[PDB]
């Protein structure tokens, strides 16, 4: 079987409970995970743990949260209290889990399926090969003996708008950004980085992306986390949104791929 988990924050009692409601079993069964994985809940050190531990059966795709969290271990960012990240910041294996943290994607895809994920969902400004390729170069940035100067080059709100002719920190930058913190589009598809509400509080002309025709939504279904206002609601047909807010006292959302059958487990706070 296949399932599909939104943003887990640190929330390690949850995710187990729900994977036990489904008999996840390694070997038998896939678990794909929207990013974030860290910070806010309790348990982020046994959460990345746990993940790298499972090996060929996940595919993880990594989420703002998890960026954040390598800059601050690698120097580049402040480590904010409210994070909770400082008992996996300590840990004698934190070379180690974040090391492997640092080489997982940013994109999967499995053709069989037709489905894509990310943490933030597809801009409607690529098609699926520039999607990949975008990951294929961010990825070999965060996978190299170089990473911390990527990290600090990370942050930044522009540019918004895609284009084959981007180069450099702007490139790398929006890619980041469109991976990571997309939720709301103008009309032409360019990103804004400020609006964190649900669709129905958002200002005019701001849409989701999701409601704006791309090549990727089109042909594949997308699954992504990221966006709790969302609350997984509101979403046309073939777009997942998993991020139900565990970490924020709402619910951690488990979807098996096979029967789209969604399994809920209620956030312990
Ligand atoms: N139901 C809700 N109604 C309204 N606001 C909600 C709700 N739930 C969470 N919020 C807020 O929404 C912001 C992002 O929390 P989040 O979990 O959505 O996403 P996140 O983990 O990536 O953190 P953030 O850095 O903010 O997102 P980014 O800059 O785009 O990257 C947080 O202040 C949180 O109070
Ligand atoms: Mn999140
Ligand atoms: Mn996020």
């Given at each position: 079987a296949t399932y599909l988990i939104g943003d887990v924050h640190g929330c390690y009692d949850e995710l187990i409970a729900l994977l036990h409601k489904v008999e996840f079993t390694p070997?038998?069964?896939?678990?794909?995970?929207?990013?974030?994985?860290?910070?806010?809940?309790?348990?982020?050190?046994?959460?990345?743990?746990?993940?790298?531990?499972?090996?060929?059966?996940?595919?993880?795709?990594?989420?703002?949260?998890?960026?954040?969290?390598?800059?601050?271990?690698?120097?580049?960012?402040?480590?904010?209290?409210?994070?909770?990240?400082?008992?996996?910041?300590?840990?004698?294996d934190a070379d180690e889990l974040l090391n492997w943290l640092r080489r997982q994607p940013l994109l999967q895809i499995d053709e069989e399926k037709k489905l894509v994920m990310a943490h933030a969902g597809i801009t409607p400004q690529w098609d699926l090969q520039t999607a990949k390729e975008c990951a294929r170069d961010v990825e070999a940035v965060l996978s190299s003996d170089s990473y911390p100067f990527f990290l600090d080059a990370m942050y930044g709100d522009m540019p918004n708008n895609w284009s084959p002719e981007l180069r450099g920190l702007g490139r790398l930058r929006f890619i980041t950004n469109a991976f990571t913190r997309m939720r709301f589009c103008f009309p032409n598809g360019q990103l804004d980085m400020?609006?964190?509400?649900?669709?129905?509080?958002?200002?005019?002309?701001?849409?989701?992306?999701?409601?704006?025709?791309?090549?990727?939504?089109?042909?594949?279904?997308?699954?992504?986390?990221?966006?709790?206002?969302?609350?997984?609601?509101?979403?046309?047909?073939?777009?997942?949104?998993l991020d139900t807010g565990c970490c924020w006292g709402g619910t951690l959302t488990c979807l098996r791929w096979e029967d789209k059958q969604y399994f809920v487990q209620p956030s312990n706070r």
């Open positions: 070997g038998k069964d896939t678990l794909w995970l929207t990013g974030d994985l860290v910070a806010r809940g309790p348990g982020s050190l046994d959460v990345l743990r746990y993940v790298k531990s499972l090996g060929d059966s996940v595919r993880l795709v990594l989420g703002n949260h998890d960026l954040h969290l390598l800059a601050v271990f690698a120097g580049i960012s402040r480590n904010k209290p409210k994070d909770r990240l400082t008992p996996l910041l300590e840990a004698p400020y609006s964190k509400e649900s669709p129905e509080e958002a200002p005019a002309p701001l849409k989701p992306w999701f409601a704006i025709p791309g090549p990727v939504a089109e042909e594949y279904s997308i699954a992504f986390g990221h966006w709790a206002s969302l609350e997984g609601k509101g979403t046309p047909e073939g777009i997942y949104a």
